[PDB]
Amino acid sequence: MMLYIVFILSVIFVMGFVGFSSKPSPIYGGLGLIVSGGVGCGIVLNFGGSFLGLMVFLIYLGGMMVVFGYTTAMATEQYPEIWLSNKAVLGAFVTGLLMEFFMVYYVLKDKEVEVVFEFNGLGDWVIYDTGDSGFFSEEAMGIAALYSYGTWLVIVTGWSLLIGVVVIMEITRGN
């Protein structure tokens, strides 16, 4: 149904993580982290945060593009592997799927699964707020606050990024 869009997207979210966690060739591993990046952007979006959802998807699209260019250089062999071409990758891929299937089965039937934490299967929609906000996006206001409120966060983040450039220039210089 439609009331369970977030739960369905989260199931697909886990399936992508089982995807690249099996560690096929990073070409397919990068594909899995892009699929989960997209649906992960959907889940956040359905909770109200559209800027956050688009940001993570956008940032991971760029990052996984650099990984692709590196895979053809440092992480490639004559016969790249798929989820079917190894027993280790196949055994791990089917393992994670069954463990997700049994969680979806018990939560949707029992309505209460306790594994470390207690989880409730009534439906994600039961916790949403009822009232409306004002004439603005609440999450947008908070992200804008980074500059008026987060002065200390900007300074460290800006400094860390600047050193990040310097650091990789030293590491990769070689000789």
Binding site: L3, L45, G123, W125, Y128, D129, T130
Partner: protein, 96 residues
Amino acid sequence: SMMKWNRERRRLQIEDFEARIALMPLLQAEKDRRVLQMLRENLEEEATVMKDVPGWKVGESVFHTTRWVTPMMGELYGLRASEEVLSATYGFIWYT
């Protein structure tokens, strides 16, 4: 040119925000009666669904405090129409 028009646009926004402010007291009053009407309807029906359960105090709170606690989506729309709930929860996010 761009600055004057933008400056004109800040004044238009204020005239738009003030009109909202003149209406909020009426919308607050309407929203209150709407929630309370729905909380009672959920309470009234629960009385006919837990009429036999031995250990059950109808309409009992779950908090120790007696303060007013704003109801969550599950409470307010307990058993309303399926499509009514979907637009209540994802109506704004999905409306484009």
